[PDB]
Amino acid sequence: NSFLQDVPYWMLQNRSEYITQGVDSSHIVDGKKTEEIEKIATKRATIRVAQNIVHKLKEAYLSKTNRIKQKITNEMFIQMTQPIYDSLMNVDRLGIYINPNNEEVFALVRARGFDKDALSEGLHKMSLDNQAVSILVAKVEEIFKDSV
Amino acid sequence: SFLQDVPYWMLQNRSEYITQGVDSSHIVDGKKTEEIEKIATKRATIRVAQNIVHKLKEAYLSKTNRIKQKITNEMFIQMTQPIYDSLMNVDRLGIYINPNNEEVFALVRARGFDKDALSEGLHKMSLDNQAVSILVAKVEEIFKDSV
């Protein structure tokens, strides 16, 4: 009953709770080279960090210390994923890992920052009031500074 | 931050047993966990097929190979279908969801296969008689050596 070998520690962890760090995979599409399945896995991972940020935001919203009075529907929160992803910058691929069982590529990624203008603008197009946007931007702002 | 309840099998290369396979499926909208589990299970079952093809391709490319007919890679790949088709009594030994990305993994093992099924399927594929006989023989071995 031999166990897998050469398995990075980050794979044994729940990185998605660093919020700015996301892990995701991609099955090896046949017609593609490993290098490309890594591209796909990396995008997914960075999208994941976006979702991580949204999940953190949705948490604070549903928190009892939430100051946002506008109603933000579950669907809206999913919408936020896009503007947030759009604003991410300086995203490093910290690692890759391929599981032998099914040849699936995993990628560890970290977004080092985001454009405040970009996020703000994006959130505004989404139909949140000024107060909400200010608070939301203020929060992903803290999520990032508090991530170092 | 270490993942808590990770099954032991998730830490092993289960496709080492050939008749066992592990594969996954990403979570998906409109889809409940229950059916992403169904999807992962089928992919895992296909792995078993793939594991079996991979094992045959090994013996075919080994020194002790007796199949004189040449079998291309595209052929070996298509050998997957008939093998999968013939699988029977496939049990789902486990399910594991990775918190990092809500991806469902599934562990399965095919307890058997139908000689007739595989044979017929292999013949349709364009292998000579001796080729089929040997391959079906080898797949027999694979399953007995997994008990």
Residue numbers in the entry:
A (entry chain A): 34 to 181
B (entry chain B): 35 to 181
Tell me what the authors wrote about this structure, in their words.
Tipα, therefore, is an important pathogenic effector of H. pylori that promotes host inflammation and tumor progression. The active form of Tipα can bind the gastric epithelial cells and subsequently be translocated into the cytoplasm.
Our TipαN25 is always dimer independent of pH values or protein concentrations under non-reductive conditions. The N-terminal loops (25–33), where the two inter-chain disulfide bonds are located are structurally flexible and not visible in the experimental electron density map, implying their nature of intrinsic flexibility.
